[PDB]
Amino acid sequence: DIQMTQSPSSLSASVGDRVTITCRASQSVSSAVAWYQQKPGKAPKLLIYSASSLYSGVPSRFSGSRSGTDFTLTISSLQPEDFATYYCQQYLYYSLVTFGQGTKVEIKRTVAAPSVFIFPPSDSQLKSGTASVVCLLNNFYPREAKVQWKVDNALQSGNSQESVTEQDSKDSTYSLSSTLTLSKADYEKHKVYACEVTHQGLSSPVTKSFNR
Amino acid sequence: EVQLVESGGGLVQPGGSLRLSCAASGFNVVDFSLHWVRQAPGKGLEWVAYISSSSGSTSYADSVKGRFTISADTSKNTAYLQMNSLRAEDTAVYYCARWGYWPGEPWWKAFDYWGQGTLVTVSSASTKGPSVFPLAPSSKSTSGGTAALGCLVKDYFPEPVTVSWNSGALTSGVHTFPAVLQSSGLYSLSSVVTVPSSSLGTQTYICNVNHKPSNTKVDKKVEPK
Amino acid sequence: IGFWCPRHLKTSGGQGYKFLGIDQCAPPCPNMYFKSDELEFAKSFIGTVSIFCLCATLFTFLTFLIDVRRFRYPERPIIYYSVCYSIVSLMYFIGFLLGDSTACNKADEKLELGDTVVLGSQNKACTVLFMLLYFFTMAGTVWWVILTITWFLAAGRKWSCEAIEQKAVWFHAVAWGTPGFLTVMLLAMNKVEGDNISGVCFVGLYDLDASRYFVLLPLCLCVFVGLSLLLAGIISLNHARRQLADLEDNWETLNDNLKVIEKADNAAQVKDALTKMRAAALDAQKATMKDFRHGFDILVGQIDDALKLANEGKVKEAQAAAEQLKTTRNAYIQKYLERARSTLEKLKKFMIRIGVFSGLYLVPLVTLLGCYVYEQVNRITWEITWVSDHCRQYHIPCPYQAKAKARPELALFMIKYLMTLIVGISAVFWV
Amino acid sequence: QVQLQESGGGLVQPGGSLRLSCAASGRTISRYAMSWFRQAPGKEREFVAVARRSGDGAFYADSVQGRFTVSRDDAKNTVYLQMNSLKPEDTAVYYCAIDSDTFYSGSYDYWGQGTQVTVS
């Protein structure tokens, strides 16, 4: 019932920069909010309690603020270990626990244009009755990148599934893969399959196609 | 040192039952309130239930009210939380948390110590081995420079599976995408490499995929077209 | 050549400050800046002003003595402020009555006129007029500073009446001692001078060093510390007032949430009202002797019990548990609320009174300080046009560089003498 | 029905500094984003910088990091590009585009004209 809104759902700061996270409550909850840190694959760890107090064990770079109904977690010094998802929790009663959407903190770097490759389905797939075509990106930093599947200028929807990796340890890059699945008789329609990718680092969409 | 451990995670049928146990070593269950926080894969944390062993103060979330149940005892120093009529949206990881009692600092401290967490999954289909299909790059697809090679494994269950190139001989430029759920309830995984030129090193690449529940060791051979 | 003093107007007596630089020069008993008729008008003007300022300051001195008590120590420095300006108003009355008898001596007849202003403390009946005017003027300023100290102590540090009263010996040591330390310095290097507009001796009239360091500087220092403590007091009470305001808002939402529960039904809105009351109780407890927050702890514990019994589907029992909060609410926290409604009673009664008293004392003083800095920036020019305008009758002094014309305005000096007395009638609005 | 105008440019000496502006008209700016582009002879349509809506993100390319700073003024509906260390090899027409996608995918529809920059 007490909805919590966390607008900056993805922050991007370089090592040594300033990170601020803002949390807003629907009701005028008292100074009882909690800030957590969850590394990928591990349990969350408490950072700030009572909306201003600092937990024992965590470094002193974390700060907790409250001015009215607004709550702010600020990390002035960004160490390489402070790369995790931070969650906002109000706690007024035991049964009124509501978490925020959470903010992802990722390494800021330069913008790289993705490289687009398309692979035709294998000969073993047509013998199984299901044909699958894949179009993948490679080495692009801003995660926001969309693809569309065009079969002779036909805008498909609902038959494409996307998967994106976590940030690479070496060059801080993502990689997106889009899978389109068709049946045997459906794969025989038209002559070409094309995937176009639109990105902020790409001035114009890049189209890769193959004939059938 | 006080710790919280969870047990009972695994694979269950939709609409079935499952029991989860959170054992608290050190502090007793009567001096603290044990909560349960659920995190869907790729989503945020959400609150499920809590128990207070002092008097009995069970409560649940609105989405699970009248469907879940929770219990705790002091003799074994653990908390039990049962499943009734599990739906597909309940597949997540469940964390066991500790919250103090009013008044004073223990209440003002939120969930301080969290458990490891056990992953639960609904099993609408039986386990089956992966089917691996190769991704041969085109002959004109960047001939002479960097090229992308990969192999596709599809229709496998359950989640944990691994992929190795030449029994782990390849490390540079290897990307393994996260697994995704298809419309049939099965998993599909993509793993690709970037081998520049030389006709992919003019040697036959292999994807050794290992699926322990299906005890399969199918090794696919990929060749350029 | 340089500067010169004529053979006429020669002292040969109790040397003091050197007029216009040269030794043994001195000013005349006729001031000769506003000569002839209007000098005597200023004599009657001072006597006219001194009557009204005597009738508004000595009138208070006999008025505070009717009660003596019942004006606490955060009312006290004004009774000694008006006593200090009771003397100051009366010395200007002494100057009007005497005229030009002991404000300057006619000396002997060895020279032409012999009428010259006394300088230094070599002659009696003038250093006394310096002792009681300057010491009780600097005291009157620092007692106002003490009043701003007491206001800041009683509104910023939340000190009680008796805690400040314990420091009464310390305040009297400074307020009678700091002007007392200065009034014994001036006697050491005899920088006391005479006067002709009002026949009372004072310091800094005919010098640029005495007025700037020992008159202009201490009032400006006392004003600066006075406004600093007054501005610190007004901002500390403004913030106190905000705590009482939002605590009263929390009490109001507690009260009307209890009202809306006590006349409603169903198990839906009772949880929503209990949520708001729990938030309000936590806010009021953290707003913030230990018994009050203990009562808040019991209050929010009963809110927790009501929430526990309301989440189980019970309405009438939850209603009884909700109405049970009054018994622990009236006897624990409401007494402190009435205490804050009896001691914060209201400092606006003092805030208005200090605001009016400082308001009607500062703007005459700033105007008085405005003429002091107007005197300081032009006295050198004023002396050099005086010696050039009257270079005909005497033996001609400094024909070189005698090109300056800036006649002083008479509408500025009687304002300075006015604002020196209007500062003392600001205590009649307190009583 | 939305037009975009840009300012700045002209013949500038090597090592100089410029402040290029990009102002739109007929459409709000508080929700959209803009991208600085670059068209040069030989290699065409490269990317420079992005300022999202409120300074929540400033993203630069491999060649323009550090020396390019973007400031945003939503009240005037204009962003500014800061030139620094002007290497005269950058004889290119700087370009500004509007981000027509609310999820920052980079859907770039309205084009405008752009401003040319010639160095030495």
Author numbering:
A (entry chain L): 2 to 213
B (entry chain H): 4 to 228
C (entry chain D): 157 to 395, 1001 to 1049, 1063 to 1118, 408 to 494
D (entry chain K): 1 to 120
What did the original publication write about this model?
To better understand the conformational changes during FZDs’ activation, we solved the structures of FZD1, FZD3 and FZD6 without G-protein heterotrimers. FZDs with a thermostabilized Escherichia coli apocytochrome b562RIL (BRIL)27 fused in ICL3, anti-BRIL Fab and anti-Fab VHH are expressed and purified separately and assembled into complexes in vitro. Finally, the structures of anti-BRIL Fab bound FZD1, FZD3 and FZD6 (FZD1-Fab-VHH, FZD3-Fab-VHH and FZD6-Fab-VHH) were determined at a global resolution of 3.5 Å, 3.4 Å and 3.3 Å, respectively. These density maps allowed us to trace the polypeptide chains and build the atomic structures of three FZDs from the hinge domain to H8, except ICL3 due to the replacement of BRIL. The CRD domain is still disordered and unmodeled in these structures, indicating that the CRD domain is flexible in both G-protein coupled and apo inactive FZDs. Through comparison of FZD1-Fab-VHH, FZD3-Fab-VHH and FZD6-Fab-VHH with inactive FZD4 (PDB: 6BD44) and inactive FZD5 (PDB: 6WW229) as well as active and inactive SMO, we found that these three FZD-Fab-VHH complexes were captured in an inactive state resembling the conformation of the inactive FZD4, inactive FZD5 and inactive SMO structures. Thus, we conclude that these three FZD-Fab-VHH complexes (FZD1-Fab-VHH, FZD3-Fab-VHH and FZD6-Fab-VHH) are all in apo inactive states. Structural comparison of FZD-G protein complexes and FZD-Fab-VHH complexes reveals an outward movement in TM6 at the cytoplasmic side in the G protein-coupled relative to G protein-free states. In addition, an inward shift of TM7 in FZD1 and inward shift of TM5 in FZD3 and FZD6 were observed at the cytoplasmic side in the FZD-G protein complexes.
